[PDB]
From a paper:
The Tad (Tight adherence) pilus is a bacterial appendage implicated in virulence, cell-cell aggregation, and biofilm formation. Our analyses reveal that [name] forms a dodecameric periplasmic complex, anchored to the inner membrane by a transmembrane helix, and interacting with the outer membrane secretin RcpA. Collectively, these data demonstrate that [name] forms the Tad pilus alignment complex, which provides a conduit across the periplasm for the Tad pilus filament to access the extracellular milieu. A structural model of [name], combined with transmembrane domain analysis of its primary sequence, predicted that [name] is comprised of an N-terminal TM helix, followed by two folded domains (D1 and D2) and a C-terminal β-hairpin that localize in the periplasm.
Further processing of the dataset, including imposing 6-fold symmetry, yielded a 2.5 Å resolution Coulomb potential map of the [name]ΔN dodecamer. From this model, we determined that the [name] dodecamer has a diameter of ~15 nm, and possesses a ~5 nm pore at its centre. Remarkably, the Tad pilus filament has previously been reported to have a diameter of ~4.5 nm, indicating that it is could transit through the [name] pore. Interestingly, the D1 domains are arranged into six dimers, whereby each domain only interacts with one other D1 domain, whereas the D2 domains are structured as a dodecameric ring with C12 symmetry. Accordingly, [name] adopts two distinct conformations in this structure, which differ in the relative position between D1 and D2, explaining why the overall symmetry of the complex is C6. Additionally, L3 forms molecular contacts with the D2 domain of the adjacent [name] molecule. These interactions lead to a very extensive interface between [name] subunits, measuring ~2400 Å2 within dimers and ~1930 Å2 between dimers, which collectively are comprised of four distinct interfaces.
Residue numbers in the entry:
A (entry chain B): 54 to 246, 258 to 268
B (entry chain C), C (entry chain A): 56 to 188, 202 to 246, 258 to 268
């Protein structure tokens, strides 16, 4: 009726080895899939991600992976770009948003310089903005809560495999900016189931 | 000590009733846990929650505020602002502005100043640290039509931008909720 | 006072029993000496110890931690990282990464920026001050295949490097336990 489930009695850091002092036993009505019944099954194993106090010990916590790798899919990658207030919508971008990446470059191919602007990546989910991170299928938030809030300097995006190179070029060949997309498009729900413009065309 | 637990499997994008939740007494309560059942009644889970799991961080809406103030045919983008650029520090969110550009052409080996209007009637979504649904402002976020994002990027990076404020008596919010380039030759002579 | 000495000639790479040891009481005990016989039972001497010698520092493993985390067909190399390179400080040891390179290649008298994937699926052994055998991180150690070592070195010095994290659902750790470059012309078209 009331099954035993093992939980953490203290704040286990990342890359820690479990002893008998860290574990505790509790009696519940339902045992989650992935839980353990006796302390001897978990002794000597390594937790590969931080476990807050009181958390139910799970099998997936004892496998190689990081906070970023637990919030993506096998057909995506996670890469970071340098951001400021102008690039990131005045500091109003939070994880879960969908953005378009715009590039400004000054080509120097045929002995002459030409400013240009293009759209490189449409509809990209934002995983981290600053010290805040998204929530994966595990239902756990792993945002670094620290005092003295410094302005954000980096953001991590979920990029398809074919575009990881295209972003990298755009990050170093010129300047980047982010354009936010509307919430009424429901790109989040749907995922749970261009010609370059020159100054000659702009100036009449 | 009290902690909420999922009694059955809750699928993605599902509302919460009293049958779904249970209360269990644990020695330590994790960060993010909820005590009374009424605190999670009517809310929606955004990831799948297997049975018996402690409920936390799955009831938080993914997204930001800027995405809640535009329409599917618009985008939100930010530009750099100073006191000269935006209305002497008298521009507030909820206004309508025209974007003007000054650039030096640099074609055919002769430089030529120019001035031109790039985007008319754009709605201001944020002025510095001010949003609607003692430090000088540094940026402003506007709601651009989907065909004008590249134009604004090119204008912002190629030259200098200024904002011209439009009148309140034009009723540009009701209509929402239903040329050429001047050169120094034309000005001087 | 009590000090442990050897009773017979102990050859290299030999385990220690109760017959090989003796206890002698000396006025001064040198640094590195062991007081009780059970402190050295089961340990191994890594250099030859002649008879009557005071036992110290011959019972210490020669080696470091990194060499215990790789296989005969792999090597360990360090690369320089910042927050942009290493995913905003959310990369831990045990993760798998792809290495991407940006270089400005010059063979014709004209410079052409390029981007390319150098190494796919590389385990991360150490992130700064973190190992599985404050101050911002500066280096990260990777387990490279033996044929790719040189390929990393060039990429580390000829241009800029970035890391792309792979998903946990791919299950590359269980697997371990048993293209063309893109130029600015392709992007701007």
């Amino acid at each position: 009726e009331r099954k035993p489930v093992l939980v953490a009695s203290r704040d286990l850091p990342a890359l820690a080895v479990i002893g008998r002092d860290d574990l505790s036993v509790e009696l519940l009505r339902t045992a989650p899939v992935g839980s353990y019944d006796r302390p001897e099954a978990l002794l000597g194993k390594r937790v590969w991600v931080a476990v807050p106090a009181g958390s139910i010990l799970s099998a997936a916590t004892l496998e190689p992976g990081g906070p970023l790798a637990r919030t993506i899919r096998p057909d995506e990658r996670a890469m970071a770009i340098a951001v400021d207030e102008v690039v990131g919508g005045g500091g109003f971008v939070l994880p879960g948003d969908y953005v378009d990446v715009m590039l400004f470059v000054r080509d120097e191919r045929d002995g002459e310089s030409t400013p240009l602007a293009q759209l490189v990546l449409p509809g990209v989910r934002v995983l981290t903005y600053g010290e805040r991170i998204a929530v994966g299928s595990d239902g756990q938030d792993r945002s670094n809560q620290e005092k003295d809030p410094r302005p954000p300097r980096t953001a991590v995006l979920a990029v398809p495999e074919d575009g990881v190179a295209r972003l990298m070029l755009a990050s170093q060949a010129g300047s980047l900016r982010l354009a936010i997309r509307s919430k009424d498009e429901e790109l989040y729900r749907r995922e749970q189931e261009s010609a370059a413009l020159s100054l000659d065309q702009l100036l009449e």
